[PDB]
Ligand SMILES: CC(C)C[C@@H](C(=O)N[C@H](C(=O)O)c1ccccc1)[C@H](O)C(=O)NO
Ligand SMILES: [Mg+2]
Ligand SMILES: [Mg+2]
Ligand SMILES: [Mg+2]
Ligand SMILES: [Mg+2]
């Protein structure tokens with residue numbers, strides 16, 4: 001197993017200047033002919049010429065049109081083609097090859113493969129070498145001239161990067177198209193697509209240059225009507241990069257293509273972005289609400305890569321967060337502006353503090369720029385993406401919008417058309433910092449530790465107020481726990497956005513203030529503070545840290561009611577729940593351990609329940625925010641706070657707390673459920689494909705959250721409401737009716753009804769599968785067996801497999817059944833999937849990420865399944881690397 005180290009980066013001894021490809025797609029094979037116009041670089045030391053090439057069948061290879069002899073002049077071991085140096089020219093030369101590949105049977109969905117009746121490539125990170133020989137690394141920039149040929153009836157639409165410069169007929173029912181893309185690019189941005197694609201299109205005129213850009217969105221014919229929202233999202237994305245960043249699209253055309261089989265959400269190939277269908281296609285009749293924000297996010301993300309990833313490119317894969325963290329941050333600014341709802345930012349924070357904080361306290365913990373890797377595929381992580389996005393967002397918080405925009409334009413102007421590293425970005429921000437601080441000695445050297453240091457910092461507080469002096473002090477400490485990456489952790493540059501709330505009237509007592517904590521601890525003093533304030537800390541979640549606010553629940557309730565910042569209100573509610581959860585968890589755990597015949601539980605704070613009611617009853621308050629306050633923190637957030645977490649005891653703890661609150665508020669929930677109906681389910685714009693109302697969708701989220709609370713509670717006659725809800729035209733509502741009917745004898749009746757509604761739309765059926773998978777059913781193992789036998793069968797579609805199994809793994813009571821049967825089931829699926837798709841097999845490992853945080857019996861059971869998986873003789877390199885790291889082996 002080869003380990004790549006960040007510190008070992010060295011430019012290649014070779015240059016590839018031009019790629020000329022001929023890709024000939026036939027029924028049983030695809031023939032790839034490639035000529036590489038190459039040169040010797042200044043770094044060359046007379047080494048062998050070694051190409052990446054994985055699973056290629058060689059027909060022939062040549063240098064300067066002289067055929068090379070296998071064994072004497074080259075060897076090939078199905079991974080590397082080695083041409084011995086004595087046969088390599090010492091100046092400009094042509095390398096040519098013809099290989100055979102088999103997209104029909106490429107179920108790993110990397111390289112060139114067949115998705116239903118579409119041929120499509122996926123080259124990031126290491127898939128171009130599965131198509132032809134190359135030095136397959138992102139600093140090998142080249143020009144591409146690509147011809148694709150195929151059966152015309154089967155494959156009438158042919159696409160690759162750049163301009164279509166020729167189209168031609170070929171004898172025997174074939175045709176070809178030539179695409180020339182003269183600007184340099186790395187090979188992972190190469191793409192090709194062939195199929196019977198249908199489209200929608202539009203023309204966009206850029207803001208400044210007034211260039212006409214043709215926009216095309218493509219899918220299979222059956223679903224082409226679902227493409228309209230994606231086209232609107234693409235127009236929105238273009239406008240936002242223009243408006244916020246002053247950045248226009250530089251090419252004549254941009255194509256988006258949906259395919260059914262895709263390992264992730266989408267890919268930013270230059271001018272030819274390729275999408276999982278579930279992240280491009282939607283309709284009001286056949287999609288749940290979540291599709292609309294997903295498509296906005298994923299179209300936005302791939303569009304923003306055209307600058308941050310495609311125009312400014314990566315030197316090497318260790319810089320991945322430089323394109324991903326920066327592009328996720330750009331998409332977050334975009335979606336926040338488009339949705340104009342506070343729940344957009346809260347949803348990103350909710351994901352970070354659950355999924356990413358778990359990763360960062362697990363054996364898999366890494367910094368956003370890792371020091372080493374074995375498998376490139378394994379470091380497309382929530383750390384690199386989502387913590388990287390928060391590190392990219394902290395520059396904006398530190399600099400403010402004006403100087404942030406100045407520093408970003410510095411980065412773009414200086415690095416456009418070139419490779420770059422994380423240092424290049426920090427340098428550009430530093431130049432703006434100097435400007436902002438009016439101080440050419442100011443620097444961001446300490447900021448670089450955000451790239452190199454793993455683990456989540458903990459930030460804690462103490463306060464003091466002197467009433468006679470009108471002087472308030474906030475004493476702040478930061479600590480990062482040592483881990484396997486750094487024995488000694490250093491203090492970070494942590495920006496702490498703060499307000500001070502007057503508890504008598506709820507008003508702001510200071511203007512906008514961002515504390516710059518740069519030491520292990522500091523004390524920030526405020527004068528002319530007329531009354532003791534309640535501090536509003538880390539507004540907007542201003543650093544990706546564990547916040548220990550040291551506030552009383554009375555203070556947190558006042559912030560929840562009266563603070564101006566949505567994150568601090570949401571966090572203050574989170575913190576009240578966490579205090580309760582840890583207390584009741586310990587009371588239940590002691591009762592279990594001590595085998596008590598009777599014991600007491602600490603009730604939920606009554607003034608907190610009153611504050612929830614107060615907010616729920618406020619007609620002026622936000623529906624999406626309301627849905628967060630009635631929901632306990634995610635299980636994966638909670639687990640970061642409990643050692644040896646007994647999942648049964650946590651399930652009992654959550655049940656008690658929800659029942660305490662429902663026992664007081666169910667009549668309120670019911671009344672809101674009914675009163676929200678008219679606006680939440682308004683059909684006025686149901687047949688307007690472009691009219692998308694994120695507040696209305698949040699009203700449905702609140703209704704569907706309330707209906708789940710009422711259903712679990714067996715609120716009187718709520719089944720009537722459930723049955724009526726199953727008749728709604730919105731899939732968010734009628735799939736919710738399946739979910740919440742789990743508590744009633746009508747479950748399988750709704751199972752059949754909603755299946756019939758879902759079965760004729762590929763993506764809707766996947767959403768139905770997810771709904772069944774996450775159903776709170778005592779017979780869920782029997783239900784999953786039925787899904788396997790009746791619907792999933794032997795599908796190799798990643799969306800199918802993820803839909804059936806991943807939601808179930810979040811079932812706290814049942815996935816973690818003490819027999820280990822849930823662990824056994826998911827391990828069987830992982831090993832089965834690994835035979836044909838290692839990347840999706842590794843995704844299916846996600847529930848094991850918390851293994852060493854559970855109680856000791858469940859730790860043992862999970863570890864046993866991971867060791868069983870590790871002992872499979874046919875295990876992929878990707879799955880083996882991942883499980884060796886996760887098990888500290
Ligand atoms: C987060 C993104 C908007 C794009 C990213 C992506 O598709 N992530 C997916 C997602 O996080 O929703 C995904 C990962 C695993 C399994 C299914 C889906 C894509 O790799 C990229 O960076 N494109 O540039
Ligand atoms: Mg092969
Ligand atoms: Mg405009
Ligand atoms: Mg299918
Ligand atoms: Mg380890």
Ligand SMILES: [Zn+2]
Pocket residue numbers: 301305323324327
């Ligand atoms: Zn990306």
